[PDB]
Structures are given as C-alpha cells and as structure tokens.
Design a binder for this molecule. Structure first.
Ligand SMILES: Nc1ncnc2c1ncn2[C@@H]1O[C@H](COP(=O)(O)OP(=O)(O)O)[C@@H](O)[C@H]1O
Ligand SMILES: Nc1ncnc2c1ncn2[C@@H]1O[C@H](COP(=O)(O)OP(=O)(O)O)[C@@H](O)[C@H]1O
Ligand code: BEF
Ligand code: BEF
Ligand SMILES: [Mg+2]
Ligand SMILES: [Mg+2]
Lengths: 374, 374
C-alpha cells in the first residue's frame, strides 16, 4: 500500500508544471503571469549589465503572447557537449543550467539560479526563440516546453540578439490570463533609471499604445520621479555611487512632507520587496549619521523618506527563490560604511537641507508626544 | 569569450549547495539552519496526518547534530526501478522525488515539492538514516549528500519508523551555527495542538533539558494557550471543524483586551506567515457576519483578536517555495462559507460574548475618532 512503487521522480520541466508556485509564484492573481515576462526581461537586463545590450523591446501581442527583443550577444547556439544538443535548448529545457553560476560571462547579474526562462518555457503552451549570433539567424519552437525541432540556421545577419515570445499555458494560469500594460510599464520605467543608456521600448499591439523609456538621470532622477507628486521639502537629493571591496553601492534619497516610508532596494537590479542586508545597512547608517549631526548641532536627546538603494554584488545570496530579501552579510557592512561616510559629508555641505530634514523628524516626534492627552 | 562552453549544468544536489537560498533560506541568521530540522519534522508530521505515526522525538545532540525519530511506516527501502537503487536513496539524492505528488500515500501532506529532505542531505556534512520497515532495520550514511554505501539490512524488528540525524555543513551555514532549544520548541508545541493524540518529545543532550508535548484540546486549546498571558475579555472560544467539498476547515478564535492582531494560518500544518486565500476568507466572513449582527441588534453604521485557521487541502498551491502564502483559490470560498454559517450561529447562541466583542470593536473606533482634537 506504500512502498518503492509509491515514489515518483519528476523529470525535465514536469516539476515546474506540477508545482508552479515553487518557481513562478501565484498562478491565479496575475503576479506569476506577469513574472513570466520579468524573468525574460531580467535576462535581457543582464546582457545590459555586462555592457552588451543597449536596446530592449517588449511587445504585448494581440494573441495574448508577449515578446522581448534584445540586442545582446545572443543565447549560445553551438552543440553542448555532455547534453548533446544546442546550448540554447539546454537552457530552455534544463533546470539549473546557465552561465551566471560563475563570473566568466556576467561579472554581475540578476540571474543566478539557472531556472527562470526554463520556467517560462515550461508554463508556456508555445514558445518561439530567435537567436542572432556568429553571423547566423537561428530559430526554434517549443510547445509546453518541448522542442518541436532542433535549433536551425534560417538566414545570415551581422546583428546580435535574442528574441523570446511566449504564449502562457492556460492549463496553469487562471483568473488573470491577460497582460496588463501598466504592470509591465512600471517595472520597465524603473529599469530605465537603473540602466542608463539602454533604450527600453514597450509595445501594446492590442491598442497601438507605446512607450520608450530612456531616462538619463540614473537613480537620482528615479528619486525625483518618485517625489514628482508629493512635495519635496528640500532641494538637494543625496546621491552617491561607489564600488569598493567588490561591492557596488548606489543610493539616492530625498524627503517629502507626507507621512509614508518608501525605500526601494535592489540587488543587480532585482527588487527586494522585503529588504535585507542592504536595507539594514542603510538604516543603521541613517540613524548613526543623523544622531551625530544632532549631537554636534546641540539638539538634546522614517516619515517622508523616499530612497533608492541599489547594489551590485558578484555572488548574491537571497533568502528565498523569489529574491525578495538579500542575505549576503558583507552587504550590510558595505552600505553602512559608505552611507556613514557620504551622508555625513552630504549634511555638512548642505546644512540648509540638513536642518529641514531633522526639523521634520523632530516635528513628528512632537506630534505623537502631543497625544499625551489622556 | 561567451559560447556553449559558458553554459554549465548543475547535477544531483550540487544546485542546492550552490544556491541554498533557493531551497533552505537564509544561511546566516539561523532561520535556514532551523528550517533544516523543520523539513524533517514536517515529513514525520505527514506520516501522522495519514494515521501512521503517533510518536515523534527530536533530539539536539552534543555534537551539534539533530535527530528526528518517528514511528511512522518508514521510508520505502526496496529497489527503485528506473533509478536502480533503494527508494530511500532516491528520495535523499534526487530533487523532485517523493510520494506526495499524488494522493495514494498521503491523502494530505505538508510536503508537495519532493525536495525537502533532499535539501537537508545536501546541506549536511553528515547524514544518518535508519529505517524500520518490512521486519528489517535498514541503515545508510551520507556525507555532503553522497551515499558512502548502499542501504543495508542490519537487524530484525517488528517496529516501524524512520530516524534521520544530520550534521549541518558549515561550508554553508554561517554566524548562527548552533541549534536553539526555544525555536524548535515553539514549533513543536504548536504542532502538538495541530496534531492531537501524537506525542512529540524534544530532547537536548547539551544540558539534559526535555519536553513532552501532547496537549489534547486541539486548536481550541491552542487559542487558550495564546491568550494565557493577555486577558481574554470573553469566556467562550469560537471553534469548529468541518470537511466539505474536499476541504478541511478548522477555526478557533477569541479576543483579549490588548491591541494586537494575531491570526495564525496553516495548510496541512505548514504555517503561512503571509496568509493567503484562507486568511482572506476568514476576514471576509468575519466582517460580513459581524455587520449583519450589528444591523440586527440596531447598531448604526482586528484589535485584540487571536485566531487559528488551519486547513486541510489535498493539493494545495502556494505562491512560493517557502509555502508562506496559500493561493488555492477554492480555499477562500471554503473558509468564507463555513465561517459565515458558524460564526453567525456562534453569536446567536452566545449573545453575551457577542455584545462584548462588538463593544470592543466599537470602543476602538471611539478612541481613534477622539483624535479629532486638531
Ligand atoms: N537574452 C539572453 N541573452 C543571452 N543569454 C541569455 C539570455 N537569456 C538567457 N540567457 C542564458 O540562459 C541562462 C539560463 O537562463 P535562465 O534559465 O533564465 O537562468 P539564469 O539567468 O538563472 O542563469 C542565462 O544564465 C544566460 O546564460
Ligand atoms: N519520515 C518519513 N516517513 C515516511 N516517508 C518519508 C519520511 N520522510 C520522507 N519521506 C518520503 O520522502 C519523500 C520525499 O521527501 P522530501 O524530499 O522531504 O519531499 P516531499 O515531502 O516534498 O515529498 C516524501 O514525500 C515521503 O514519501
Ligand atoms: F534567472 Be535565474 F533562474 F536566476
Ligand atoms: F517537502 Be517537500 F519538498 F514539499
Ligand atoms: Mg534568468
Ligand atoms: Mg518533505
């Protein structure tokens, strides 16, 4: 009734179809459905991080599919030894297969699990792959993760690029089956701030609607754009970009007169909705740097803050498969030391801003303490 | 400089060692280190869910290892066809391999990915496996996930059981390398409330300290125990257990005079720190049932609530690999319909409690509205 016959092994992409939650996320509320695009976008953005991709075009087609065109190096096409098929297919049909397991192809990348586009192939009733590399145009087609034919040359070109178009399987995603412009747009807008000098085009063929994102101001202008609708209470955005002890740290921030706290963290451009070591360094330096400034300015002894903290780390570790929280320990200490040094400078060189920020922080403690009215 | 040679495939458990974050979680803060135990405990608890395990003993050894003994059916020992080795080894060395992919061995289980104890084997410098099944005692030993010898009979017994002891690899976990009594204890305490009639023993061989958890009152008494230190403002805990349309729903709750909101959700006994469809049904029924009761009692038109919502579902879907959030859509609607029917009854049959709970909820809106003092 329960023995060795009871124990089944899932091969290839079957485990992804069997358990999409593990790999793509919520298959019902639209978040996994949109994450199918992002997985593909992130692989492009990774070509960009490495200096090989300056244009990305994401297209929402009229048949419910979505495509992502990059002018990167193109997924490798030659025969994989060991696996005995094109390298391109190995990456589409094998889990834990890729070139971000070391640092030889992307010094730094979002990807690291060797799975993402594998997942997309598996949860897609159809996938189309068009590779421009080594002078040749190569192409292949899959259905529910199955190659209907080996990868084949179908022309000649000088261009370099990868194009992936997928039609999600409805045998997996439910309720939210249609792609939403604004969800894709918000993430690509943010990508353009994180990737200066890369053109990111968003096309919707359902209604002719279009976007071209290519802001220049980097995460500085990201901050401005986030304070676009609240009122910044001080004119000088704190900003820096450093790269020390193998870690890239880049921070921008600026306070408005509202009451929210919005600190957007990123590791190799992937968002951490739940923070992690980089957030924690950010807060420890904020609090230490601030309190010294008060002590010095003779004061005795969060709200309105918008900030972007973006780090570049060679081999990050997350807490989970969603990359929602960064754990690489050495990153707390890197953001800490850097903020402490430069925020401290910032306050000296901008004493007018300083006093205003601290004046807001004081004002808020005064408000709550004026509910000693019991 | 970047071609087919650039694309590496990780085989067996190497991908777990390479990316533990994906599979075990934070390797630095102790949470993944403790999750190594829980993975093993959950597999035992699963034997219990199926009616085959009435005792679990978890032992913290003096050499930094931990063991988990169950009187379940024992992991299968016979040769696996296809894989050509004992079924036991397949489960220890293969990803996406197990018997919770269908419903033939566990109608309902925490496990579903076919990975957990595989992960533990991989992140353990040593593992020991002792299986009591089919009259024979079987045993095997691994090192960094590698079987030092096939699985072997080493005695005869009538007993049935599985014993796993592991010594975490320090080449993976950092900072927090030592097991903490209280973390294991808190989860096993809770397990005993969720699993009535199962004895769960916790042993620490570092200091002779011991616990035996075997509460009888089920999730009802779980609630009492959570209100043990705050003041319950009403004597009758709302409770029910139903199983309808293939879904088990069990809820207990009770309000105290504090201001926190603590609603503990579970699916096949796994915690959802971030809620999901079961939480959402719980809140929608709470609010609908409450508002009808006010309307009826002539009132015009969260805080202090402690509740446990535990569901039993055959094939759950989570949003992520951590099982932190449940997405199985049909579960919103099941908890909704059941709460609505029975909470409504509860308020009728206990009008004294009713008025008190609603009186607290009114009191809180009165307090905040008395900060119209601007
Ligand atoms: N647009 C692209 N251009 C070049 N290489 C790509 C592209 N997309 C995917 N790849 C290759 O495929 C590999 C595996 O892809 P994926 O499964 O998404 O996982 P990962 O990015 O986790 O390694 C990548 O590491 C990269 O080497
Ligand atoms: N204590 C146990 N008793 C009986 N069977 C077990 C035990 N632990 C593990 N197993 C078997 O091993 C399988 C795979 O284990 P695991 O890798 O933890 O994944 P899962 O529980 O996700 O299937 C289980 O599904 C179950 O069939
Ligand atoms: F994109 Be990989 F799976 F990190
Ligand atoms: F325990 Be299994 F990996 F869900
Ligand atoms: Mg990727
Ligand atoms: Mg398991």
């Amino acid at each position: 009734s329960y023995d060795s016959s009871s124990i089944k092994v899932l091969k290839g992409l079957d485990a992804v179809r069997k358990r999409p939650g593990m790999y793509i996320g919520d298959t019902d509320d639209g978040t996994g459905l949109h994450h199918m695009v992002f997985e593909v976008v992130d692989n492009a953005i990774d070509e960009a991080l490495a200096g090989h991709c300056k244009e990305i075009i994401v297209t929402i087609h009229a048949d419910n599919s979505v495509s992502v065109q990059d002018d990167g190096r193109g997924i490798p096409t030659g025969i994989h030894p060991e696996e005995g098929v094109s390298a391109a297919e190995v990456i589409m049909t094998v889990l834990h297969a890729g070139g971000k397991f070391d640092d030889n192809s992307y010094k730094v990348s979002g990807g690291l699990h060797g799975v993402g586009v594998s997942v997309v192939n598996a949860l897609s009733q159809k996938l189309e792959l068009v590779i421009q590399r080594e002078g040749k145009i190569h192409r292949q087609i899959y259905e529910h993760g199955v190659p209907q034919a080996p990868l084949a040359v179908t022309g000649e070109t000088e261009k370099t690029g990868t194009m992936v178009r997928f039609w999600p399987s409805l045998e997996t995603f439910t309720n939210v089956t249609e792609f939403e412009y604004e969800i894709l747009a918000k993430r690509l807008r943010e990508l353009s701030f994180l990737n200066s000098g890369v053109s990111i085009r968003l096309r919707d063929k359902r209604d002719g609607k279009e976007d071209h994102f290519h802001y220049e101001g980097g995460i500085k202008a990201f901050v401005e754009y986030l304070n676009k609708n609240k009122t910044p209470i001080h004119p000088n955005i704190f900003y820096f970009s450093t790269e020390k002890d193998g870690i890239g740290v880049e921070v921008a921030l600026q306070w408005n007169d509202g009451f929210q706290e919005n600190i957007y963290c990123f590791t190799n451009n992937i968002p951490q909705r739940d923070g992690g070591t980089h957030l924690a360094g950010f807060r420890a330096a904020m609090t230490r740097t601030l309190n010294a400034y008060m002590d010095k300015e003779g004061y005795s002894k969060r709200e309105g803050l918008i900030a972007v903290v973006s780090v570049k780390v060679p081999d990050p570790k997350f807490s989970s498969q969603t990359k929602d929280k960064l754990v690489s320990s050495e990153v707390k200490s890197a953001v800490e030391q850097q903020m402490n040094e430069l925020l401290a400078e910032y306050l000296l060189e901008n004493p007018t801003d300083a006093k205003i920020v601290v004046g807001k922080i004081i004002d808020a403690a005064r408000a709550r303490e004026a509910a000693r009215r019991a």
